Ligand binder design. Structure first.
Ligand SMILES: C=CC[C@@H]1/C=C(\C)C[C@H](C)C[C@H](OC)[C@H]2O[C@@](O)(C(=O)C(=O)N3CCCC[C@H]3C(=O)O[C@H](/C(C)=C/[C@@H]3CC[C@@H](O)[C@H](OC)C3)[C@H](C)[C@@H](O)CC1=O)[C@H](C)C[C@@H]2OC
Ligand SMILES: C=CC[C@@H]1/C=C(\C)C[C@H](C)C[C@H](OC)[C@H]2O[C@@](O)(C(=O)C(=O)N3CCCC[C@H]3C(=O)O[C@H](/C(C)=C/[C@@H]3CC[C@@H](O)[C@H](OC)C3)[C@H](C)[C@@H](O)CC1=O)[C@H](C)C[C@@H]2OC
Lengths: 107, 107
């Protein structure tokens, strides 16, 4: 499933609804902290909409639990991410993923 | 995992090794038989190599158990395919996939 652990609290009242665009910054890491990707390194937020199979399920369920301005660590089991296959040449088979996500705005 | 059920036997001696190119024809279906893709409909075999995260894990383990000329049904659990996310706009969350695969040749 997905576990959400809060680094900095959000506003406690504006939570993502389907059809809104979530604007986020993220750093993706393996369980030992090794970074494989980051939008912060590109200085460009990532945007996506809930409800459209646009992101791995771990993100669809984890970001829905965050309010605007919150920064959280999402730990996602392989079945809610790339499972037994992994993602070619970046993520191994059976990997639990850790994302540092900041929900900046809803559009 | 992956279950392999044989429709027509292969030669019983030439099995795929890593670094060989497998040439196949396939039809992918949901568990109720609804077709979502087929190389046979495009009249063009699909080619891939074992060992390179080029296909879902269910195929890497299932085709390794087939010999040249064999036609088999591969039933693949969601964790060995697209898990809880699915594949956007084609495959739902938590779907077991059935592939009719024919191993035509190894290159
Ligand atoms: C159309 C092609 C390019 C298109 C690319 C972008 C818009 C640029 C965007 C910043 C992605 C990154 O590009 C630098 C890069 O992000 C990762 O590094 C990563 O951190 C990650 O895991 N993320 C990204 C941030 C949201 C969560 C997750 C994801 O859900 O990502 C999604 C993903 C890969 C899901 C698959 C989709 C197929 C399903 O079958 C499978 O389901 C099992 C899950 C991405 C957003 C796709 O929806 C759309 C894309 O692919 C991947 C390790 C590899 C990925 O590059 C491809
Ligand atoms: C570079 C982009 C285009 C590139 C496309 C081709 C060479 C054309 C090729 C005939 C694919 C089909 O195009 C008509 C189409 O085949 C499906 O319909 C399907 O029947 C299927 O399931 N197949 C295809 C036959 C082998 C098994 C499986 C697969 O393993 O496919 C792989 C797959 C999607 C794996 C993801 C990769 C990311 C991982 O993170 C994730 O791991 C959880 C698993 C394909 C071969 C990729 O390796 C490479 C591609 O994507 C998918 C439902 C959607 C897919 O279109 C994209």
């Amino acid at each position: 499933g997905v576990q959400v652990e809060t680094i900095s609290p959000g506003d406690g009242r504006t939570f993502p609804k389907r059809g809104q665009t979530c604007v986020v910054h993220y750093t993706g890491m393996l369980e030992d902290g090794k970074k494989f990707d980051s939008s912060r390194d590109r200085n460009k937020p990532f945007k996506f909409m809930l409800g459209k199979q646009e992101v791995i399920r771990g993100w669809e369920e984890g970001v829905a639990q965050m309010s605007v301005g919150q920064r959280a660590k999402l730990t996602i089991s392989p079945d809610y991410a790339y499972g037994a296959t992994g993602h070619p040449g970046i993520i191994p088979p059976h990997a639990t993923l850790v994302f540092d996500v900041e929900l900046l705005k809803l559009e």
